Structures are given as C-alpha cells and as structure tokens.
Amino acid sequence: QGEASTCWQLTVRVLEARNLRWADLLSEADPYVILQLSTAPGMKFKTKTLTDTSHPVWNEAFRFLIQSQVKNVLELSIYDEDSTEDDICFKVLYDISEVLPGKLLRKTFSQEEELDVEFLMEETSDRPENLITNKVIVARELSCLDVHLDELELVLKGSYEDTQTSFLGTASAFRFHYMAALETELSGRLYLTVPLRPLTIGKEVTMDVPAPNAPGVRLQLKAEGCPEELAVHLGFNLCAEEQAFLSRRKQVVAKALKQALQLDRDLQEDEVPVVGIMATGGGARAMTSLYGHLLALQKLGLLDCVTYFSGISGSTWTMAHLYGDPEWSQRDLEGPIRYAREHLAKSKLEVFSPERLASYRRELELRAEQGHPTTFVDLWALVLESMLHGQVMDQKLSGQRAALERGQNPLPLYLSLNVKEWVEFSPYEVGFLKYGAFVPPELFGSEFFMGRLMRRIPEPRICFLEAIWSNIFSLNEASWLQPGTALAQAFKGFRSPNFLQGLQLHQDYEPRLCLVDAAYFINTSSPSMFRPGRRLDLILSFDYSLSAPFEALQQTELYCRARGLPFPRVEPSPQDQHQPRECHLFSCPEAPILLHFPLVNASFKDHSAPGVQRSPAELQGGQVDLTGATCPYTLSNMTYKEEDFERLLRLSDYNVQTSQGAILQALRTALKHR
Ligand SMILES: *[P@@](=O)(CCCCC/C=C/C/C=C/C/C=C/CCCCC)OC
Ligand SMILES: [Tb+3]
Ligand SMILES: [Tb+3]
Ligand SMILES: [Tb+3]
Numbered sequence: 001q002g003e004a005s006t007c008w009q010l011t012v013r014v015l016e017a018r019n020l021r022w023a024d025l026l027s028e029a030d031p032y033v034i035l036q037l038s039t040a041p042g043m044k045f046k047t048k049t050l051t052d053t054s055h056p057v058w059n060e061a062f063r064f065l066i067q068s069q070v071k072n073v074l075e076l077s078i079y080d081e082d083s084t085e086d087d088i089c090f091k092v093l094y095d096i097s098e099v100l101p102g103k104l105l106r107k108t109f110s111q112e113e114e115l116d117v118e119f120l121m122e123e124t125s126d127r128p129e130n131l132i133t134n135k136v137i138v139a140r141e142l143s144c145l146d147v148h149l150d151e152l153e154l155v156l157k158g159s160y161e162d163t164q165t166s167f168l169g170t171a172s173a174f175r176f177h178y179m180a181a182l183e184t185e186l187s188g189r190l191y192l193t194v195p196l197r198p199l200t201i202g203k204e205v206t207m208d209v210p211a212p213n214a215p216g217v218r219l220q221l222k223a224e225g226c227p228e229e230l231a232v233h234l235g236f237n238l239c240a241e242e243q244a245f246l247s248r249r250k251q252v253v254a255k256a257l258k259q260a261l262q263l264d265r266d267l268q269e270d271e272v273p274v275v276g277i278m279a280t281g282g283g284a285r286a287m288t289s290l291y292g293h294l295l296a297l298q299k300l301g302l303l304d305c306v307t308y309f310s311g312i313s314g315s316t317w318t319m320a321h322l323y324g325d326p327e328w329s330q331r332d333l334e335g336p337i338r339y340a341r342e343h344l345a346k347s348k349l350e351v352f353s354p355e356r357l358a359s360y361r362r363e364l365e366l367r368a369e370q371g372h373p374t375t376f377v378d379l380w381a382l383v384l385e386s387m388l389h390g391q392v393m394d395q396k397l398s399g400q401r402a403a404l405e406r407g408q409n410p411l412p413l414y415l416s417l418n419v420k421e422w423v424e425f426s427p428y429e430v431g432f433l434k435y436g437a438f439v440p441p442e443l444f445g446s447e448f449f450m451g452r453l454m455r456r457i458p459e460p461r462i463c464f465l466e467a468i469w470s471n472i473f474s475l476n477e478a479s480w481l482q483p484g485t486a487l488a489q490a491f492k493g494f495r496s497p498n499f500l501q502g503l504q505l506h507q508d509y510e511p512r513l514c515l516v517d518a519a520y521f522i523n524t525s526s527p528s529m530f531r532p533g534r535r536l537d538l539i540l541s542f543d544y545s546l547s548a549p550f551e552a553l554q555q556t557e558l559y560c561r562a563r564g565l566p567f568p569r570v571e572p573s574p575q576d577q578h579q580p581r582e583c584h585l586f587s588c589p590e591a592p593i594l595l596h597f598p599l600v601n602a603s604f605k606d607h608s609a610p611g612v613q614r615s616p617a618e619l620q621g622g623q624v625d626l627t628g629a630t631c632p633y634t635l636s637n638m639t640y641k642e643e644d645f646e647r648l649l650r651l652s653d654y655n656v657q658t659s660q661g662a663i664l665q666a667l668r669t670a671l672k673h674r
C-alpha cells in the first residue's frame with residue numbers, strides 16, 4: 001500500500017532575463033518572476049519587482065521540497081507590473097527530473113526573450129515522507145492542524161481549506177489539511193503567524209491573538225497526522241463486491257448454459273466462461289436497437305449466460321432504465337420496450353415550453369444553493385430526463401446493487417469519455433481506469449482531498465450521470481435553432497473538481513456548439529471489458545453505426561494492441577465492408593472470442609423471423625430506412641414514430657436470433673478454453 005521516500009531540497013535561483021518586450025506606449029517593462037511547483041498547489045514565490053528594464057537582473061534564490069517519486073513540474077513566469085492585473089510575457093514549464101543532486105545546473109529558457117536560472121538539488125536529513133501509491137497515482141503524506149479557541153481569520157496557504165473565518169467566541173475549533181512536505185505558516189487575525197516546517201513532529205503551541213481595540217483571544221495549536229482513512233481506493237484489481245458478484249453470477253450462468261448447450265454435467269465455477277455484452281453509442285437509435293438485441297438474447301435463453309454488460313452514450317439509456325427494475329432480465333422485456341417506444345413517440349414540443357424550463361432553472365437554483373457547480377451538462381441532464389421519461393425519475397446508480405444481490409442480472413458498466421481518459425461506472429464502484437483510482441457511486445459528486453472525503457454530498461439522481469455518459473455539448477439544422485432560443489431566453493440571469501483532487505502522479509510513470517472530436521461518437525465500450533481483473537472469454541459486440549460498422553472494433557484492436565492485451569485481429573474483407581451481414585466472427589489463442597453484430601438490414605428484408613420467408617403482406621416490415629435522406633434514425637432525431645421504432649427493434653431482435661448458431665458455437669469454444 002504505502003512507500004517511504006525522502007524528499008530532496010531544490011534551491012532554484014533566478015538570475016536574469018534578457019530582451020523583455022516593453023509595455024505599450026513606449027514604456028519599458030517593470031518586471032518580476034513567479035515560481036510555482038505543480039506539486040505544491042497553493043504556494044507561490046515572487047521576486048522583487050524591478051523598474052523599466054528589458055534585461056532585468058533579480059539574482060534571488062528560493063527553496064522547495066521535492067518528492068523524488070512524484071512528477072514535479074516547475075512553472076516559472078515573468079510578468080510586467082501594471083498599475084490592472086499584470087500582463088505575462090514569458091512562461092515556461094520545466095520538468096525537474098533532469099536536475100541531478102549535488103550537480104549544480106544552469107539553464108536558459110526561451111519561447112527572443114531569454115531567462116537564466118540556477119538549480120541545486122541537495123540531500124537532506126528529514127525523515128522520509130509516507131506516501132500511499134498505486135505506482136501511477138500517489139497520495140502525498142498529509143498532516144492536520146487542530147486549532148482550539150481558548151471575526152477570527154485563520155489562513156494556511158497550501159491547505160485544502162485555504163482560509164477559515166469564524167465568528168463565535170465560545171469554545172470553537174478548526175482543522176486544516178495540508179501536505180507534510182509543505183514549508184508554510186499559519187496566520188491569525190481579528191497578522192501574527194506561526195511557521196510550519198516540513199516533515200517534523202508537531203508540538204503544542206499557544207498564541208494570543210490581539211484584537212485591534214479590546215482584550216485578546218488565545219489559541220492552542222497542534223500539528224498531527226490526519227485522522228481520516230483513504231476513501232478513494234488505489235489499485236488495479238477488482239473490488240470485493242465485484243468479486244463476490246462474480247461467484248453469485250457465475251453459478252446462474254452454469255445453470256443457464258446447461259440448458260442452452262444441453263450439457264453432460266454441472267460446471268465448476270472455475271470453468272464457467274466470462275461473457276460480455278459490449279454496446280457502442282448512438283442516441284435513440286442505439287437505445288432501441290439494444291432493447292431488441294437484449295430481447296433476442298432473452299428469448300434464446302442466452303441473456304442468463306452474460307456476466308458483464310457495458311455501454312456508452314445511448315446504450316446507457318437502455319441500461320439505466322432496465323436496471324431500475326432489480327430483476328429486469330428475468331421479467332418480460334416488452335414492458336420496458338413499450339415504455340421506451342411511447343416516450344420516444346411523444347412529441348417533444350412540451351420539453352422546451354416555459355413551464356418545464358421554469359422547473360429546470362428552479363432545480364438549478366436549488367442545485368446552486370447546495371454545494372454544486374452549474375454546468376451545461378446538468379441542464380442537458382434535465383432535458384434528457386424530460387425526453388426519456390415524462391417527469392423526474394428518482395433512481396440512483398447505487399440503487400442498482402438491488403439488481404445484483406443474487407446474481408440475477410449482468411454487471412452494468414457505464415463507460416464515459418472525459419477531458420482524454422475513460423471513466424467507468426458500476427453500481428459497485430466508479431473511477432479512472434488509467435489511474436486505478438475508484439470510489440463507490442454514492443460518493444461520486446462529493447468533495448475530496450488527497451484521497452480523503454472532505455464533505456459528503458447527496459448522491460445524484462441517475463439522469464445527471466446519464467448526461468456525463470451521453471454529453472454532446474462543447475464547453476461553449478433549422479429544427480433545433482428554435483429550442484435553443486426558447487432555452488437561452490428562459491435562462492437569462494445566470495471550477496468543478498473530481499475525487500482525484502490533490503492526488504499526484506508517480507514519477508517512473510472558432511467557437512463550437514457540440515462536441516466534435518470523433519472519439520465521442522465513434523467507440524465501443526471496450527475499456528470496461530479489458531480492465532485488469534476481468535478476463536473476458538466471449539464478447540458480443542453490438543454496433544449501432546450507420547456506416548463504418550467495423551471502425552469501433554478496429555479502435556479496440558489498436559487500444560488492446562498498445563497495452564499488450566491479447567485481442568483477435570479485426571480484418572474484414574472488402575466484401576464485408578460493402579455489404580456486411582448479421583454476425584461476424586473474429587478468431588494468440590488466449591484472446592477473447594468476438595461476435596460482432598453490425599446494424600445492417602440484410603436477410604431481414606425477406607425474412608419475418610429466423611428461417612421464415614417474408615409474406616407479401618408483411619413485406620413493408622422488412623424495409624428499414626437505414627440509409628438515404630429522411631432516415632429517422634439519425635443521431636439528431638429523438639422522436640421515433642411508433643411504426644419506425646418497431647422496424648428497428650424487430651430488425652435487431654431478428655439479426656441476433658438468426659445468428660443463434662454462431663453464438664452457441666462460440667459459447668462451446670469458450671467452454672473448451674478451459
Ligand atoms: P451519445 O450516443 C448521445 C447522443 C445524444 C443526441 C441527442 C440530440 C438531441 C437534440 C436536443 C438537444 C437539446 C438542446 C439543448 C440546448 C442546445 C442549444 C442551447 C442554445 O453520443 C455518443
Ligand atoms: Tb514604470
Ligand atoms: Tb500587479
Ligand atoms: Tb493588460
């Protein structure tokens with residue numbers, strides 16, 4: 001879990017700059033330098049401010065504590081003192097891995113303008129810092145400042161609580177959290193200050209703080225290790241709950257495989273193959289087709305062989321609604337299908353009417369009053385909730401553990417592409433796959449520090465997560481320039497950290513309206529299926545693209561290729577790209593088996609059910625508008641005429657059912673893996 005490492009002492013000295021651009025109006029520059037260390041977030045150093053020189057010589061020197069095991073980046077920058085805010089003229093980030101100890105380095109930086117600096121890394125005889133590392137994330141050692149009381153402003157630069165300001169005068173107290181390696185000071189006022197040297201055993205300290213006019217206040221100070229246990233779990237292993245669930249699930253899979261594969265005997269847990277559903281995004285189109293694919297899997301008695309179930313964007317809408325009912329996979333799916341169809345067909349002129357807009361901004365004001373940022377994504381959560389359901393829907397990701405108690409459904413993995421890193425959400429845990437940093441979903445949204453929970457916030461209604469998962473907007477045709485105006489005008493009158501806040505990295509490791517980067521709209525949920533502990537043996541890949549039905553998979557090949565993860569090569573023949581078919585097999589024989597299901601209208605044209613010719617009365621049922629203009633399944637569109645909904649759903653149901661042979665074939669093969 002932990003690691004003891006000694007800090008070094010970096011002594012940087014700022015010598016001179018040369019060729020400093022002037023101020024406007026022929027005035028020469030009044031310059032100074034500022035040093036900030038990436039891994040010392042609250043702290044600044046600042047050189048004297050010289051006057052009217054384009055070749056200024058400060059020759060001052062400052063001191064830091066550098067933890068060798070963390071990635072330390074020094075941002076040093078020259079400003080012109082403006083008598084407004086000061087205009088920057090030179091900035092340069094410098095990784096101080098380069099700088100070796102004992103060896104004195106001189107550097108010159110440039111990006112005309114030149115700045116000369118001298119570093120010296122010196123050993124030191126402080127005790128080693130006590131880290132908690134993941135070999136890619138590091139939690140720096142903390143310490144805590146208990147302050148007892150017998151218009152007070154306590155300030156401690158470098159501390160999660162920057163400045164605390166209390167008003168009572170009858171037995172109050174305060175805690176500050178801050179790194180041990182910070183050289184800093186507590187400052188009190190009604191400006192006396194107490195130094196805080198780094199990495200020492202703290203003593204008791206009293207200070208009398210003068211009132212300006214009246215008698216004085218007393219304060220007891222102790223510095224200690226922190227009391228709080230790490231709320232964030234750092235690791236590249238599956239959590240206990242997931243592990244527990246795997247057993248719980250694996251048996252119902254063997255019980256369900258035996259009938260589907262008409263098997264000789266019962267299976268031991270260690271031989272049960274791990275099968276995953278892997279859905280891509282695609283708005284309303286992805287949602288309804290997915291319902292259909294699930295329907296097929298239920299009818300074939302195969303949905304009960306599925307251990308994991310992952311999705312992105314639209315797929316998650318299907319997923320979230322289904323997991324609301326804690327036993328959806330056992331009950332009739334045509335209930336939820338009907339729900340989806342009706343709400344999809346309901347016209348959405350209401351969702352942008354000022355009665356509803358009121359209730360959004362009213363929930364945003366209520367939301368703003370509580371500890372909450374106002375982001376566009378939070379509004380998108382409210383309108384999406386309003387389209388997807390008629391009303392507020394009071395369900396929560398934690399609540400979906402209901403659906404897993406007895407291994408009665410697969411484990412839902414909602415994947416989310418952030419500003420780029422992948423964030424996976426399960427009812428058990430949520431976090432960054434790249435950093436092996438995870439929390440349980442209740443705490444998602446809460447305020448954190450250095451891997452410790454600082455303020456617990458109420459777990460949010462799932463639609464706010466669905467917006468994260470299916471966000472379509474940047475940080476900034478004729479149909480939807482009008483609700484835009486309706487919204488903007490109703491909303492007139494109107495910074496957000498995550499649970500990683502504080503954590504650090506281990507060393508050895510024109511304006512737009514929507515998102516546009518292709519990553520957001522073209523990937524499958526592979527990352528979830530390839531997380532460290534999961535060992536997937538079969539993947540059913542559902543793809544909801546209307547062109548490029550193999551791009552998302554090739555992305556995955558690439559992804560796994562770059563991480564030394566076994567994965568079969570997706571090389572579809574020229575014929576396959578042009579007119580693909582309902583199911584494609586792929587297959588380093590330790591790599592998962594992969595059945596890929598394009599969104600294609602192939603044999604469904606003239607078959608009403610697997611193996612059955614289409615009657616001329618139902619011919620229209622097989623014609624599905626997946627190409628050509630006025631196709632109703634465009635990503636834009638979020639009202640599907642009940643007729644259109646059905647075509648796509650049945651196509652999807654069919655495409656899977658009609659591929660029953662290959663699935664069963666694949667499952668047999670997965671069994672003989674071991
Ligand atoms: P996922 O599959 C998510 C796809 C979502 C597409 C749905 C499109 C909806 C159009 C409605 C927009 C609401 C308007 C919001 C406000 C914008 C204008 C403000 C001035 O992606 C991978
Ligand atoms: Tb001047
Ligand atoms: Tb200034
Ligand atoms: Tb300016």
Ligand SMILES: [Tb+3]
Binds near residue numbers: 517
């Ligand atoms: Tb880009």
